[PDB]
Amino acid sequence: MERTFIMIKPDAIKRRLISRIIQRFEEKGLYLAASKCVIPKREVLETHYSHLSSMPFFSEMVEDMMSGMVLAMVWVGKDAVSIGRKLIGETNPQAASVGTIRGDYGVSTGKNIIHGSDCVENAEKEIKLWIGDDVQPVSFFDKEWIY
Amino acid sequence: MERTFIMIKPDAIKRRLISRIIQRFEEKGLYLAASKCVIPKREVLETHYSHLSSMPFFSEMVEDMMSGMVLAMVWVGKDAVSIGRKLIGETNPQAASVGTIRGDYGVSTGKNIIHGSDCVENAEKEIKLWIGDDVQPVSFFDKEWIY
């Protein structure tokens, strides 16, 4: 099925939001397929956010993502990308709906808790960038109860 | 600080217990240092359970442990091995105290949710077997409030 790249940002790790974030994805029915703790490298962040290279404060946005360990994941399932974006909420947590990850826990645009892919093309690039080309297939153990 | 190896067994993944399990460790104050999604290989399992190789249930245990993805983790902190053991509870879920992972979620000894290292010696052996030689130092971000 479709897959998406979900990364818990360094400050959300430090706020101990890991279980609360994973609950949203796991209760929605998506399948965890990969997981990795990483201290992000500057070069990898610049590639991840290459579409942002022209924007004001690009350097600061990269620096913020370098301040500590992230939890990088792949979640799989029907409409995974759109589903993840909806669970996460608007870029700016003030605009995100209550009940979303950013709406419930987030305060600023720079520390907005989590990254999720915005489209299938970017998900594939991000997965290969952060995780690798050999993410192994997982069993859709309860597919019949969800679809 | 001390490290322990914590692995969510495949049936617990299928029961969607990931967030509830991580919650116990995260709220207790231990630090996540490594995370990997793995479909276990036979030779790995045969090494890990080498002390059980004469038992009549051995092949079944290996098959069950190969029946899906496991989530393998390292958690770090003062007394992390003993702390993880207590959070998890006794091997037989019917002997485990209510409030433990096994006591709250587990019914049978075979499908007892999770594995955690029994001592520091085994934790080190287990991390090297399942994760690798190079787990990076973790930032103890809220150490002064806990330890």
Curated annotation (Swiss-Prot), chains A, B:
Its cofactor is Mg(2+). One of its GO terms (biological process) is GTP biosynthetic process. Pfam families: NDK. Keywords: ATP-binding, Kinase, Magnesium, Metal-binding, Nucleotide metabolism, Nucleotide-binding, Transferase. InterPro entries: NDK-like_dom (IPR034907), NDK-like_dom_sf (IPR036850), Nucleoside_diP_kinase (IPR001564). Its EC number is 2.7.4.6. PROSITE patterns: NDPK_LIKE (PS51374). The active site is at H115 (pros-phosphohistidine intermediate). One of its GO terms (molecular function) is nucleoside diphosphate kinase activity. It is an enzyme of class 2 (transferase). Disulfide bonds: none annotated. It comes from the Eukaryota. It catalyses: a 2'-deoxyribonucleoside 5'-diphosphate + ATP = a 2'-deoxyribonucleoside 5'-triphosphate + ADP; a ribonucleoside 5'-diphosphate + ATP = a ribonucleoside 5'-triphosphate + ADP. ATP binds at K9, R85, T91, R102, N112. Belongs to the NDK family. Major role in the synthesis of nucleoside triphosphates other than ATP. The ATP gamma phosphate is transferred to the NDP beta phosphate via a ping-pong mechanism, using a phosphorylated active-site intermediate. This is Nucleoside diphosphate kinase. The lineage of its organism: Eukaryota, Fungi, Fungi incertae sedis, Microsporidia, Unikaryonidae. The gene is NDK1.
